[PDB]
Structure 1
Amino acid sequence: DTLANEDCFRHESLVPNLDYERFRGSWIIAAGTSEALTQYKCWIDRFSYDDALVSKYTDSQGKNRTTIRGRTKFEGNKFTIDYNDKGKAFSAPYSVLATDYENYAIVEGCPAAANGHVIYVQLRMTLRRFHPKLGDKEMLQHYTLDQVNQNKKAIEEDLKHFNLKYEDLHSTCH
């Protein structure tokens, strides 16, 4: 019942010795294989310090901004998130399947909110690349698409490895 013998993962990671300190920071979830997760728009995960997680998302009109907080535990590529009672539908085991640390990562996991399985693509969110161009209604959405496009070859190559294509994912940030 630990991460060591978690059975819901379907794929072998390309990053079994994931460097958690390098993985840490803010990530925006661009797309994934779960229809249910399309209801949580422009989700940003913020992994910080030893084991902290702050997750923030909206509905599809950008209304009802929601924040859930939790604790993580990493063993190589595997990680659990235990959310505060609030986001318990998202508490699950997860696995980083691929990342270049600096730009993108592809993650699998088994939350109830995803009908027990999802693979998703996330791009790094940093003020070094994100200049809220004051006047933009679609701040997040434009950032995400540009970051996707900029890293598209690498993302597509890794997805191919897990028998997926970007175009087959549901977009989860416009």
Structure 2
Amino acid sequence: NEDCFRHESLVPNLDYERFRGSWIIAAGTSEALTQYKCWIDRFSYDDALVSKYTDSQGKNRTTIRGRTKFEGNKFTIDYNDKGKAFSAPYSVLATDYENYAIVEGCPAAANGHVIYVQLRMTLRRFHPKMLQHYTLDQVNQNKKAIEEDLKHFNLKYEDLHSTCH
């Protein structure tokens, strides 16, 4: 769906290997996605993806797995029949690779379109003493940068639905 994307990426030459890793989705423009809390995407190896999220009460833990295909900033996810509502074209609009990324995509689950902000999930910064606090602090630590890129796409972090709290 190279036609469903609405913005031009600031990282058209996205380095997949640097983008690879775990990411927690902190907030986005889709009210329908608020149903899946503290969503964590784990991109690994050549084209593997493991996505995990819960119910709004921390329960109903769910995992869906898929295969990715990247073309610069663009990538498709093909989830196993389970998670089909999330299979779709996506595009990394901005990222510093080490801390955050802003992604646009067109999954049916988001009523066809969403722009979300994700922060890197790593044991280097995460000490399970929980997820919500981790996400908030990471957003706060990178607020300046996130706000600036978001601004570039006519959005404000405050205008997004929080999807991990």
Question: For the superposition of Structure 1 and Structure 2, which TM-score range results when normalised by the shorter chain?
Answer: over 0.9
Separation in structure 2 between the aligned mates of residue 101 and residue 13 of structure 1, nearest angstrom: 14
Q: Which runs of 5+ in 2 are unaligned?
A: none
Counterpart residue number, 2:9: 13
Q: Say how many residue pairs are matched.
A: 165
Query: 1:21-64 deviations in whole A, cap 9, x for unaligned?
Result: 00000000000000000000000000000000000000000010
Q: Secondary structure at the match of 2:127?
A: coil
- 1:100 is displaced (CA, Å) by 0.1
- 1:124 is displaced (CA, Å) by 0.1
Separation in structure 2 between the aligned mates of residue 63 and residue 47 of structure 1, nearest angstrom: 23
Query: 1:97-147 deviations in whole A, cap 9, x for unaligned?
Result: 00000000000000000000000000000000000019xxxxx00000000
Aligned-pair RMSD on alpha carbons?
0.9
Query: 1:65-96 deviations in whole A, cap 9, x for unaligned?
Result: 00000000000000000000000000000000
Pairing 1:150-161 to 2, within 5 Å after superposition: 150-161=141-152
Deviating above 2 A after TM superposition, structure 1's stretches of 4 or more consecutive aligned residues are: none
Residues 1:81 and 2:77 aligned together: yes
Counterpart residue number, 1:118: 114
Separation in structure 2 between the aligned mates of residue 168 and residue 40 of structure 1, nearest angstrom: 18
**Identical columns (%):** 99
* Aligned with residue 98 of structure 2, among 79, 98, 102: 102
Separation in structure 2 between the aligned mates of residue 98 and residue 154 of structure 1, nearest angstrom: 10
- 1:6 is displaced (CA, Å) by 1.3
Q: Secondary structure at the match of 1:85?
A: coil
Separation in structure 1 between the aligned mates of residue 123 and residue 137 of structure 2, nearest angstrom: 14
What's the TM-score once normalised by structure 2's chain length? Answer: 0.99
Separation in structure 2 between the aligned mates of residue 20 and residue 131 of structure 1, nearest angstrom: 26
What's the TM-score once normalised by structure 1's chain length? Answer: 0.94
Counterpart residue number, 2:160: 169
Separation in structure 2 between the aligned mates of residue 117 and residue 131 of structure 1, nearest angstrom: 33
* Aligned with residue 34 of structure 1, among 27, 30, 35: 30
Separation in structure 2 between the aligned mates of residue 8 and residue 53 of structure 1, nearest angstrom: 22
- 1:164 is displaced (CA, Å) by 0.1
Which structure has the larger Rg? 1
Separation in structure 1 between the aligned mates of residue 43 and residue 140 of structure 2, nearest angstrom: 24
Counterpart residue number, 1:44: 40
Query: 1:140-168 deviations in whole A, cap 9, x for unaligned?
Result: 00000000000000000000000000000
Separation in structure 1 between the aligned mates of residue 150 and residue 32 of structure 2, nearest angstrom: 21
Q: Which runs of 5+ in 1 are unaligned?
A: 135-139
